[PDB]
């Protein structure tokens, strides 16, 4: 896939304009204050994530800016950004669709979801639409396995997907409205479909079954 080396380009040279907004600087100060004194170098991942959330992707200038803000080596910053997969070292679209193709999602047939996304967006996996609105990649497990098949778009989880359902999700994204995340098969969450096999009775409440002497 991607290459874990850097090449200077006119869009990703170490002179591209990046700087934190003052509210982002306040958030960085909050993260550093959360971490201990003398171990404030542990704030590399949240500050890098904040830089990514500000700028979209993470240029080499943003990496160097995070390094000089945290007084941590730029090589350590590069190590973090290249080890971890949620940091985009290349520009991506406005909507970054991640399709989980791990084994239970494959069992619940996420391959149809992947091929219908490829046909609908007119692109292959790992590439961006020419209008820079959609990037489509395969990923590993995203933590919602009983809700297979599923995608993640930006920070939002779309679950119990049929090809028709992911088509309306893409249509809503193209129209510009919020696609109302969650499962799309009529069930609310991970509960069993067609009835509730547990937790039918109301919860008992405080002071239930408490032992003596407490």
């Amino acid at each position: 896939g991607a290459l874990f080396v850097h090449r200077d380009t006119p869009e990703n040279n170490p002179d591209t304009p990046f700087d934190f907004t003052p509210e982002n600087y306040k958030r960085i100060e909050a993260i550093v204050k959360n971490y201990p004194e003398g171990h404030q170098a542990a704030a590399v991942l949240p500050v890098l994530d904040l830089a990514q959330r500000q700028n979209g992707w993470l240029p080499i200038s943003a990496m160097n800016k995070v390094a000089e803000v945290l007084q941590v080596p730029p090589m350590r910053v590069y190590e973090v950004a290249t080890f971890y997969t949620m940091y985009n070292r290349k520009p991506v679209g406005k909507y970054h669709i991640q399709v989980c193709t791990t084994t239970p999602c494959m069992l619940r047939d996420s391959d149809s979801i992947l091929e219908t996304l490829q046909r609908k967006l007119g692109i292959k996996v790992g590439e961006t639409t020419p209008d820079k609105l959609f990037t489509l990649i395969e990923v590993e497990c995203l933590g919602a396995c009983v809700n297979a098949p599923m995608v993640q778009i930006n920070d939002n989880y779309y679950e119990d997907l049929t090809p028709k359902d992911i088509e309306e999700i893409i249509d809503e994204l193209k129209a510009g409205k919020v696609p109302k995340p969650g499962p799309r098969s009529g069930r609310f969450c991970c509960e069993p479909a067609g009835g509730l096999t547990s937790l039918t009775e109301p919860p008992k409440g405080p002071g239930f079954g408490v032992q003596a002497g407490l």
Partner: protein, 42 residues
């Protein structure tokens, strides 16, 4: 005591800065951090 309706809808209107802004808001409730005896490990 409604049980037939999903009531987690508060996570639907969450922007890209919700976690960081709430951390910044909550930062005034924390205890002072311990000191490692140095500004940095150098």
């Amino acid at each position: 005591t409604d049980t037939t309706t999903y009531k987690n809808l508060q996570h639907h209107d969450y922007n890209t800065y919700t976690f960081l802004d709430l951390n910044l808001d909550l930062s005034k409730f924390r205890l002072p951090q311990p000191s490692s005896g140095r500004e940095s490990p150098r």
